[PDB]
């Protein structure tokens, strides 16, 4: 898989964004994975990649000068994974998602704690992406 590269890059930022004794309120819920696997799955996934690339990661990079390059590295890897599909097979037949909107609104309400929460759940994100592809 080309996900190993993405998972490698994420292992490098995992520790930084991981947070303690929080009542583990999951941001990337089952509904999102359900959306990824449904009729508008392609659109939900493309929107989530866009959201991470344009709204999450650039904010994540500014949390600490020492984590910046590694966040940017993860971003490049995500952009690559994108192109890989975005310009090839049936993995992105599309050019909305209730679940995704819910994620953005929850993220917004969490503000900066939201940046850390979204980054720490990136492994869950890759898993949902994997779940998506393992279904085509």
């Amino acid at each position, epitope marked *: 898989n080309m996900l190993r590269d993405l998972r490698d890059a994420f292992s490098r930022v995992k520790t930084f964004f991981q947070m303690k004794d929080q009542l583990d309120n999951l941001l990337l819920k089952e509904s999102l994975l359900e959306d990824f696997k449904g009729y508008l799955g392609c659109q939900a996934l493309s929107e989530m990649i866009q959201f991470y690339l*344009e*709204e999450v990661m650039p*904010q994540a990079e500014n949390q600490d000068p020492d984590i910046k390059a590694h966040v940017n590295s993860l971003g490049e890897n995500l952009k690559t994974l994108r192109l890989r599909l975005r310009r090839c097979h049936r993995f992105l037949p599309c050019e909305k998602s209730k679940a995704v909107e819910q994620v953005k609104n929850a993220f*917004n*309400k969490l*503000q*900066e704690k939201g940046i850390y929460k979204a980054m720490s759940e990136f492994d869950i994100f890759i898993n949902y992406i994997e779940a998506y592809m393992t279904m085509k």
Partner: antibody
Amino acid sequence: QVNLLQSGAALVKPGASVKLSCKASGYTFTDFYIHWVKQSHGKSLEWIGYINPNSGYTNYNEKFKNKATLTVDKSTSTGYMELSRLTSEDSANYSCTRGVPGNNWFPYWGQGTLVTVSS
Amino acid sequence: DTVLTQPPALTVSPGEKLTISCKASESVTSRMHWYQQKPGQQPKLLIYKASNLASGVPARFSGSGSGTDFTLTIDPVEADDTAIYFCQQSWNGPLTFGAGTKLELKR
């Protein structure tokens, strides 16, 4: 050389809307977010929300979601905030500020625009 | 939403040490910032992320704290420091500000 130039004071009638602007200069416009803040006479500061100029993505304070609409014109490095259904409660000094993405604190402020809602 | 509680008013003399407390209703980790607003002026950032001095701000200003309890310290304070000081948090949405602490200089 960073500068946020706001549009002029506005005397507007109850029930109408008004659109404020914030012209940015001195930096790469798409590298920073534009936030809007409200300060009513009496001085309490309230955050309205932000807009990421690169994408148009917004984050609104729930308290202003039915009152304010943020937009940007990437091509002219200008941010806008439209206030609708004006009441006397909306009379205040509104300011735009520049934020490093992910660092919601404000080193740079526009000069402020005073909105007076009256017949 | 996170409520920030700061004293409404404080009086101190030039040359002395002044501390302003700001308490949040829930943790904001290190994301507490401070502004100085003089009459007729827009707010000016003094301290960011609890203890970092904003560029251009004199070293007489410092801050400390994490979690729910923070303090802005001006040492020594001087006559033109009369103004209103605001604390603001960015850890939780929406961003919120304290009600402001008006600083009076005794003479």
